Design an enzyme around this catalytic site. Structure first.
Site, PDB file in Angstrom:
ATOM      1  CB  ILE A  12      -4.251 -37.827   1.756  1.00 40.05           C
ATOM      2  CG1 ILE A  12      -5.204 -38.768   2.190  1.00 40.05           C
ATOM      3  CG2 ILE A  12      -4.274 -37.832   0.027  1.00 40.05           C
ATOM      4  CD1 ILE A  12      -5.212 -38.868   3.845  1.00 40.05           C
ATOM      5  CB  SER A  34       5.099 -35.667  -6.578  1.00 41.73           C
ATOM      6  OG  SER A  34       4.407 -35.087  -5.705  1.00 41.73           O
ATOM      7  NE  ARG A  35       3.302 -29.342  -8.399  1.00 42.83           N
ATOM      8  CZ  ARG A  35       2.767 -28.427  -7.907  1.00 42.83           C
ATOM      9  NH1 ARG A  35       2.607 -27.467  -8.735  1.00 42.83           N
ATOM     10  NH2 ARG A  35       2.248 -28.264  -6.750  1.00 42.83           N
ATOM     11  CE  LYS A  88     -11.954 -35.862   0.765  1.00 40.48           C
ATOM     12  NZ  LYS A  88     -12.106 -34.667   1.608  1.00 40.48           N
ATOM     13  CG  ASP A 166     -11.395 -30.900   1.419  1.00 43.36           C
ATOM     14  OD1 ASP A 166     -11.007 -31.467   2.440  1.00 43.36           O
ATOM     15  OD2 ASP A 166     -11.139 -31.157   0.343  1.00 43.36           O
TER      16      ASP A 166
HETATM   17  N1  LIG Z   1      -6.701 -35.562   5.924  1.00 44.65           N
HETATM   18  C1  LIG Z   1      -6.490 -35.323   4.597  1.00 44.65           C
HETATM   19  O1  LIG Z   1      -5.559 -34.462   4.384  1.00 44.65           O
HETATM   20  C2  LIG Z   1      -7.287 -36.113   3.439  1.00 44.65           C
HETATM   21  C3  LIG Z   1      -7.970 -37.042   3.948  1.00 44.65           C
HETATM   22  C4  LIG Z   1      -8.923 -37.925   2.720  1.00 44.65           C
HETATM   23  C5  LIG Z   1      -8.753 -37.378   1.744  1.00 44.65           C
HETATM   24  N2  LIG Z   1      -8.236 -35.949   1.092  1.00 44.65           N
HETATM   25  C6  LIG Z   1      -8.151 -35.698  -0.194  1.00 44.65           C
HETATM   26  O2  LIG Z   1      -7.106 -35.744  -0.831  1.00 44.65           O
HETATM   27  C7  LIG Z   1      -6.860 -34.251  -1.863  1.00 44.65           C
HETATM   28  C8  LIG Z   1      -5.755 -33.452  -0.866  1.00 44.65           C
HETATM   29  O3  LIG Z   1      -5.355 -33.585   0.531  1.00 44.65           O
HETATM   30  P1  LIG Z   1      -3.822 -33.657   0.619  1.00 44.65           P
HETATM   31  O4  LIG Z   1      -3.196 -34.287   1.622  1.00 44.65           O
HETATM   32  O5  LIG Z   1      -3.540 -34.176  -0.980  1.00 44.65           O
HETATM   33  O6  LIG Z   1      -3.343 -32.026   0.246  1.00 44.65           O
HETATM   34  P2  LIG Z   1      -1.992 -31.510  -0.666  1.00 44.65           P
HETATM   35  O7  LIG Z   1      -0.863 -31.897   0.469  1.00 44.65           O
HETATM   36  O8  LIG Z   1      -1.937 -29.886  -0.528  1.00 44.65           O
HETATM   37  O9  LIG Z   1      -1.975 -31.993  -2.234  1.00 44.65           O
HETATM   38  C9  LIG Z   1      -1.189 -33.278  -2.364  1.00 44.65           C
HETATM   39  C10 LIG Z   1      -0.161 -33.084  -3.447  1.00 44.65           C
HETATM   40  O10 LIG Z   1      -0.600 -32.790  -4.818  1.00 44.65           O
HETATM   41  C11 LIG Z   1       0.286 -31.748  -5.520  1.00 44.65           C
HETATM   42  N3  LIG Z   1      -0.342 -30.466  -5.916  1.00 44.65           N
HETATM   43  C12 LIG Z   1      -0.778 -29.418  -5.545  1.00 44.65           C
HETATM   44  N4  LIG Z   1      -0.975 -28.686  -6.308  1.00 44.65           N
HETATM   45  C13 LIG Z   1      -0.974 -29.225  -7.647  1.00 44.65           C
HETATM   46  C14 LIG Z   1      -0.981 -28.891  -9.037  1.00 44.65           C
HETATM   47  N5  LIG Z   1      -1.516 -27.769  -9.489  1.00 44.65           N
HETATM   48  N6  LIG Z   1      -0.616 -29.649  -9.921  1.00 44.65           N
HETATM   49  C15 LIG Z   1      -0.257 -30.928  -9.783  1.00 44.65           C
HETATM   50  N7  LIG Z   1      -0.067 -31.449  -8.268  1.00 44.65           N
HETATM   51  C16 LIG Z   1      -0.237 -30.536  -7.169  1.00 44.65           C
HETATM   52  C17 LIG Z   1       1.172 -31.423  -4.589  1.00 44.65           C
HETATM   53  O11 LIG Z   1       2.344 -32.386  -4.626  1.00 44.65           O
HETATM   54  P3  LIG Z   1       3.706 -31.525  -5.762  1.00 44.65           P
HETATM   55  O12 LIG Z   1       4.074 -30.377  -5.387  1.00 44.65           O
HETATM   56  O13 LIG Z   1       4.940 -32.638  -5.402  1.00 44.65           O
HETATM   57  O14 LIG Z   1       3.179 -31.717  -7.201  1.00 44.65           O
HETATM   58  C18 LIG Z   1       0.439 -31.800  -3.088  1.00 44.65           C
HETATM   59  O15 LIG Z   1       1.677 -32.161  -2.285  1.00 44.65           O
HETATM   60  C19 LIG Z   1      -8.081 -33.796  -1.539  1.00 44.65           C
HETATM   61  O16 LIG Z   1      -8.827 -34.108  -2.739  1.00 44.65           O
HETATM   62  C20 LIG Z   1      -8.424 -34.095  -0.161  1.00 44.65           C
HETATM   63  O17 LIG Z   1      -9.911 -33.750  -0.032  1.00 44.65           O
HETATM   64  C21 LIG Z   1      -7.334 -35.823   2.218  1.00 44.65           C
END
Ligand SMILES: NC(=O)c1ccc[n+]([C@@H]2O[C@H](COP(=O)([O-])OP(=O)(O)OC[C@H]3O[C@@H](n4cnc5c(N)ncnc54)[C@H](OP(=O)(O)O)[C@@H]3O)[C@@H](O)[C@H]2O)c1
Ligand SMILES: NC(=O)c1ccc[n+]([C@@H]2O[C@H](COP(=O)([O-])OP(=O)(O)OC[C@H]3O[C@@H](n4cnc5c(N)ncnc54)[C@H](OP(=O)(O)O)[C@@H]3O)[C@@H](O)[C@H]2O)c1
Lengths: 306, 306
Positions: A12, A34-35, A88, A166
């Site tokens: 996202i 970001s890691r 969120k 979610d």
């Molecule tokens: N369509 C969608 O995807 C969407 C839409 C609206 C809102 N959201 C919200 O946005 C959030 C995630 O969706 P997403 O796209 O972001 O999924 P995601 O790609 O799995 O998470 C985003 C990044 O956060 C980092 N991450 C994962 N675990 C971590 C940890 N312990 N510590 C630190 N960083 C960590 C990771 O980057 P690094 O490995 O580089 O640290 C990951 O690439 C959720 O709260 C979701 O509900 C998503």
């Protein structure tokens, strides 16, 4: 220009956060944490602690990581004196968020629990239409194939990941914005595959305070129809939100709507809240979900499997 | 002198509510509602709706029934113009309690979400001693055999009945009164028998907003020792509450206390609340249990017997 950092450059962040930011001249993107990713054209850090230590003049931080790590990231950013925008759900618990909001308040800082689907184009006109009217019933259908829309994602199945709630909390974030009275959960059923920790489907039976029934079905299992619909039944006809808030019809006529700019709108609202020294922390959608996890009956189903 | 109605004449109403009321001159017991019981010397009704229709000059209502029916009863009593005292948990959901609180304010009515263990004689001395000391860690152990203490009770195992959190929330209501800072849940594990809908054991890993670890173990299973203790480590020694808050020691040395009068004190506070025109709705112990149902890992265990 408000100096902005962004944490957790994943799906996202790249699809919505970075484009919207670059198109808000009110923020200037300064650094990212970001890691396993880097964003070109800004300074990049592995974690937020190293970002906060090095970016002393940074003003604001926006958290795009999974919700299980939001509390510790939001807390650290407020300790270091930064405004905070939360993806969120705003946290993995209600208690987290209450502490974050008291903390922000104490320091004069802006805390923004965002609900992007609240910024869908149908939400505000449906809320204006529904203010006065007598409502009879609401039904929500939020069904998609998790494998098609969240391929290989794991944290959604871990404690604090909500599972099917979610995307389901998105619909609740619309419902609680467009109806005028508060909701009480009367009954819920959660359906949990035996190899995961969160529900793959749920039915929710609520009522607002005049007793108007509100029903919602959430489902992430393979099925015939992907749908993101809210239908309000009224004396004056049916208001039907579809396509996740992007389409609206009133009494059977399409409503002409401006195009979809959810994340542009959120960042504009975050910039206005900073300008006014204010916060926007509505946790009612999370509170309803918590009530479902607390009060719902739970049923075991077949393994999600590979 | 407040005219009072009591709803749900079961075990706690017999054991504590009625004798507390009879010894409180502030209240006159006027009428009871219960589907399968009758109280001597007062008018009796099969249910609360009947009681409200014939008890016109009634002032206040105390609810002593299971939590799953608390909302419909409290809302009716508030809508009929009566002050309301809630047994704990104040509801089966947080949303329903927020609705009651808002409704009582709109009407000017008193709503009192009670927590009888907060009136145990150890709590206020413990709150006073801890208010500004340096706290290192907190440990909570609330373990008893449900077969010994809650025999034949079945609503504890249904949705909204809390399971081992029905006594567990008592401890949480003491911890949350005596500790100066708010709690955040960081991890929870819930142990749920395959034939019930609520857990029989749970572990909570909490931290306060200074980082102080707060651990709690709850268990309703057969075990070696019954215990109901809250132990607090400080630089000035250990404060230890035992026997559910009836016993208090400071640095090994016992502290002597008023005798146990939990429900006399609950009813004295309710009367005083009605005198002042205020409410007392602390849902923090329930909000924390809801965080554990939301965030906690769940493990299915062998069937409880029923
Ligand atoms: N369509 C969608 O995807 C969407 C839409 C609206 C809102 N959201 C919200 O946005 C959030 C995630 O969706 P997403 O796209 O972001 O999924 P995601 O790609 O799995 O998470 C985003 C990044 O956060 C980092 N991450 C994962 N675990 C971590 C940890 N312990 N510590 C630190 N960083 C960590 C990771 O980057 P690094 O490995 O580089 O640290 C990951 O690439 C959720 O709260 C979701 O509900 C998503
Ligand atoms: N027992 C304890 O250890 C204890 C101690 C302190 C506080 N509490 C709290 O006090 C509350 C009640 O506890 P309890 O121990 O007295 O349970 P209980 O023995 O089951 O008594 C509750 C009474 O409420 C009525 N009841 C049951 N289902 C009902 C329904 N659908 N609708 C209306 N009335 C219903 C029943 O009376 P009728 O069948 O006659 O209608 C029942 O006798 C609980 O919230 C509990 O947490 C319990």
């Amino acid at each position: 220009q408000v100096s902005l950092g962004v944490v957790g450059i994943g799906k996202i962040a790249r699809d919505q956060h970075l484009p919207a930011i670059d198109a808000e001249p009110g923020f200037k993107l300064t650094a990212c944490a970001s890691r396993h990713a880097e964003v070109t054209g800004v300074r990049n850090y592995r974690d937020l602690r190293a970002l906060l230590a090095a970016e002393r003049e940074l003003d604001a931080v926006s958290l795009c990581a999974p919700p299980q790590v939001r509390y510790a990231q939001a807390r650290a950013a407020l300790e270091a004196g930064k405004h905070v925008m939360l993806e969120k759900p705003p946290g993995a618990t209600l208690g987290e968020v209450a502490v974050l909001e008291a903390l922000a308040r104490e320091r004069g800082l802006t805390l923004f629990a965002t609900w992007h689907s609240r910024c869908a184009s149908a939400v505000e006109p449906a809320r204006e239409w529904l203010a006065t009217r007598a409502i009879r019933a609401v039904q929500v259908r939020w069904k998609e194939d998790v494998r098609r829309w969240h391929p290989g994602q794991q944290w959604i199945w871990e404690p604090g990941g909500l599972g099917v709630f979610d995307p389901g909390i998105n619909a609740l974030s619309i419902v609680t914005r467009i109806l005028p009275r508060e909701l009480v959960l009367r009954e819920a059923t959660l359906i949990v595959p035996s190899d995961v920790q969160t529900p793959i489907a749920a039915e929710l039976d609520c009522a607002d305070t005049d007793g108007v029934p509100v029903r919602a079905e959430f489902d992430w299992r393979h099925g015939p129809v992907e749908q993101w619909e809210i239908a309000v039944d009224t004396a004056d006809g049916v208001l039907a939100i579809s396509r996740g808030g992007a389409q609206l019809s009133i009494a059977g006529e399409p409503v002409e709507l401006g195009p979809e700019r959810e994340y542009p709108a959120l960042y504009a609202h975050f910039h206005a809240l900073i300008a006014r020294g204010e916060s926007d922390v509505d946790v009612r959608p999370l509170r309803l979900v918590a009530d479902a996890f607390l009060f719902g009956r739970r049923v075991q189903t077949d393994a999600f499997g590979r």
